[PDB]
């Protein structure tokens, strides 16, 4: 099967340099042109580079021309995106895409899974987890407020996977250049508080995992 699998990225201070790579599988690399495309957190799609089948030609949009360089090595079936003098506008998830020829144009057939690139100057901060128990019916909604964390991907696992089917997770909204999210879970009254409910927050950017037994007020 055609595979596109991209590597590199993360959190860089503005002004840093970086390099992204993407690895190809299950199709003849040299015979296709390869591009990168970025998507803003707000689900915005922007084309950023293109290389030809050989070396031949490169092409660039006018939002990065001068800072980015796109490269292939057809000995290994891998693209390269070096990005120099990164600024705040460069935050996005970056995909590598194959370009195929059509009747009179081109078209992006397969896209990899993207890596994420957060350009910013703030520290990496672990999250503060607070239990959300009530201060009267036959089903209980508990929660966990996960507050003040910087690098955005967090994870909330409830009783270690068990209660997935009744869990709402709410996208992290930014303010104070910290991220704040919430997660709710639902549970038959026969389950709580007779048995432990514990939400579990892990923050890979800091290697911090916190646990919180929801106990009743």
């Amino acid at each position: 099967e055609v595979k596109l699998v991209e590597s590199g990225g993360g959190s860089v201070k503005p002004g840093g340099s970086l390099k992204l790579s993407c690895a190809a599988s299950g199709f003849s690399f040299s015979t296709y042109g390869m591009s990168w495309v970025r998507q803003t957190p707000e689900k915005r799609l922007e084309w950023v580079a293109t290389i030809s089948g050989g070396g031949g030609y490169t092409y660039y949009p006018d939002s990065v021309k001068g800072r980015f360089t796109i490269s292939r090595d057809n000995a290994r079936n891998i693209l390269y995106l070096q990005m120099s003098s990164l600024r705040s506008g460069d935050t996005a998830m970056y995909y590598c895409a194959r370009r195929v020829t059509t009747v009179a144009e081109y078209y992006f057939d397969y896209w990899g899974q993207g890596t994420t690139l957060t350009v910013s100057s703030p520290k990496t901060t672990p999250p503060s987890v607070y239990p959300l128990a009530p201060a009267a019916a036959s089903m209980v909604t508990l929660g966990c407020l996960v507050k003040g964390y910087f690098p955005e991907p967090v994870t909330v696992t409830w009783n270690s996977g068990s209660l997935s089917s009744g869990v709402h997770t709410f996208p992290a909204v930014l303010q104070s250049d910290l991220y704040t999210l919430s997660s709710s879970v639902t549970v038959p009254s026969s389950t709580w508080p007779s048995e432990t409910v514990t939400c579990n927050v892990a923050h890979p950017a800091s290697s911090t995992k916190v646990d919180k037994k929801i106990v009743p007020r």
Binding site: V103, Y107, F170
Partner: protein, 212 residues
């Protein structure tokens, strides 16, 4: 310098109905192509050139257009289709449209509201967050007002919205009011209330601080 604006940004269809989203260009264009993007996964190939379907896509999809106004049409809607559909041009600068959020439409649901006093843990730190969960409702457009001691507030409310549930096809919303410890203990009766095109009068949920 060549913009595509895609016409209905959000759209709700029920299964069995026709769906037409549009992509209109700032100047004349030879062809336009469409991609599909579901939550958590990259865009996938959907329609290329104008009317040419990709191998995977069902036969109830369809494409057309010429010049400045092209359009993707769905013959009969099925719930498996809900995703964001982008267009893209290839004549000048490789520009993507803004997408069209395709939603499943179901019978309306009023939320299941739950209010939570700040934790004994946060308060000892200098802060107090009051949190409200409105759970499993449709449609999505809601208003939520928090009234403290009978008056109202909008400072420091953070409002978050799930993506549509893959089973009951609802939405969930959180609402968090971030006070200070001293600001929190200045009042007594914190109330969140939800207004919605289901119930006529709001769904109120309340607690009192000088109680615990």
């Amino acid at each position: 310098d060549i913009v595509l604006t895609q016409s209905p940004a959000i759209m709700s269809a029920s299964p069995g109905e026709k769906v037409t989203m549009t992509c209109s260009a700032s100047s004349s264009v030879s062809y336009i192509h469409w991609y599909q993007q579901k939550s958590g996964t990259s865009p996938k190939r959907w329609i290329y050139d104008t009317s040419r379907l990709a191998f995977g896509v069902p036969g109830r999809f369809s494409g057309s257009g010429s010049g400045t106004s092209y359009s993707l049409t769905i013959s009969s809607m099925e719930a498996e289709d809900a995703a964001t559909y982008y267009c893209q041009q290839w004549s000048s600068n490789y520009t993507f449209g803004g997408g069209t959020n395709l939603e499943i439409k179901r019978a309306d649901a009023a939320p299941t509201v739950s209010i939570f006093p700040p934790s004994s843990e946060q308060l000892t730190s200098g802060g107090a967050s009051v949190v409200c969960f409105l759970n499993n409702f449709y449609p999505k457009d809601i208003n939520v007002k928090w009234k403290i001691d009978g008056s109202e507030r909008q400072n420091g409310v953070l409002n978050s919205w799930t993506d549509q549930d893959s089973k009951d096809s609802t939405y969930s919303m959180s609402s968090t009011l971030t006070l200070t410890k001293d600001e929190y203990e200045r009042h007594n009766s914190y109330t969140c209330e939800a207004t919605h095109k289901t119930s006529t009068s709001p769904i109120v949920k309340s607690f009192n601080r000088n109680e615990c």
